[PDB]
Amino acid sequence: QTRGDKATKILSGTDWQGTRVYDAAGNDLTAENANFIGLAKYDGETGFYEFFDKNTGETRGDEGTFFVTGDGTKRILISRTQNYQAVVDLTEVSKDKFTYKRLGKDKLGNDVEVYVEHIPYHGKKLAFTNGREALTNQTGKIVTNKSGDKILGTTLWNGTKVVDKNGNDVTAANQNFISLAKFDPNTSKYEFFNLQTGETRGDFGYFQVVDNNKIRAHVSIGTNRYGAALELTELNNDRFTYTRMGKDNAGNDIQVFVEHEPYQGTYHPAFTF
Numbered sequence: 001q002t003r004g005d006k007a008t009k010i011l012s013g014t015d016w017q018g019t020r021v022y023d024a025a026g027n028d029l030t031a032e033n034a035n036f037i038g039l040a041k042y043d044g045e046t047g048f049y050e051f052f053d054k055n056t057g058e059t060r061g062d063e064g065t066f067f068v069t070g071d072g073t074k075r076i077l078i079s080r081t082q083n084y085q086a087v088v089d090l091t092e093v094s095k096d097k098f099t100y101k102r103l104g105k106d107k108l109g110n111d112v113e114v115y116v117e118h119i120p121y122h123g124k125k126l127a128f129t130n131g132r133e134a135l136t137n138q139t140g141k142i143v144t145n146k147s148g149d150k151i152l153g154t155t156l157w158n159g160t161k162v163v164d165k166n167g168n169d170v171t172a173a174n175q176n177f178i179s180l181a182k183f184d185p186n187t188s189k190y191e192f193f194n195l196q197t198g199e200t201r202g203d204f205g206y207f208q209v210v211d212n213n214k215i216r217a218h219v220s221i222g223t224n225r226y227g228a229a230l231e232l233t234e235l236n237n238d239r240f241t242y243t244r245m246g247k248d249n250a251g252n253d254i255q256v257f258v259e260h261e262p263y264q265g266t267y268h269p270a271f272t273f
């Protein structure tokens with residue numbers, strides 16, 4: 001069990017409610033950062049979260065993938081309904097108290113570091129509006145009795161091939177998806193690098209393999225901020241493959257499958273963050 005695994009178990013064990021927002025000195029800034037206060041339901045098994053309104057109990061319409069980094073230091077959210085991502089530094093994860101810090105506002109409207117406290121919620125029984133759906137795309141063995149993250153951590157990887165749903169090669173139509181990829185399971189850091197030059201593609205941040213090894217989720221904190229929760233269709237020491245939208249050889253928009261295998265080139269890329 002990692003420190004992230006321990007945190008995730010605690011987040012999954014109860015519903016939560018934000019209580020107060022404080023600066024480090026304990027000045028109450030809740031009214032100036034009211035939007036940081038709501039209810040939450042976390043399901044570690046499916047790597048899924050949903051937020052609800054503190055006063056009414058109704059969904060905030062914000063659901064998606066969450067995780068805690070392996071080292072226990074950060075929570076990542078990737079919203080599939082509200083088109084954002086967030087990384088926050090965790091300061092406590094205990095059965096009676098969950099706290100993170102981030103940027104907020106003081107009474108004069110200045111930027112300050114604030115701490116958002118939460119305690120267990122025992123009000124309305126909360127249910128996911130949608131939940132993690134079934135994921136049924138598969139192109140090879142998907143290992144489930146070992147940590148997905150640890151499988152990615154075994155080697156540098158590179159994209160080797162892109163195929164359509166019938167196995168037709170469409171790699172030349174999707175070269176933008178072909179990178180040298182580095183994954184660190186302990187820190188949950190990933191970075192993509194150019195295969196020709198060894199240099200970062202400027203796409204880097206935090207990743208985790210979630211949902212019984214069926215999703216690779218990541219958030220880019222680089223030049224172009226985005227997140228993704230990509231369904232894995234093969235995952236083992238020889239190969240991993242995810243599916244997403246791409247192009248066919250004619251330039252039509254189609255479902256594609258991006259295969260990766262352990263990298264055999266000469267580069268030994270370093271994280272640039």
Ligand SMILES: [Cl-]
Nearest residue numbers: 064065080229
């Ligand atoms: Cl998601």
Ligand SMILES: [Cl-]
Nearest residue numbers: 145146147150
């Ligand atoms: Cl393991």
Ligand SMILES: [Cl-]
Nearest residue numbers: 167168169170
């Ligand atoms: Cl082919």
Ligand SMILES: [Cl-]
Nearest residue numbers: 143236237238
């Ligand atoms: Cl394997």
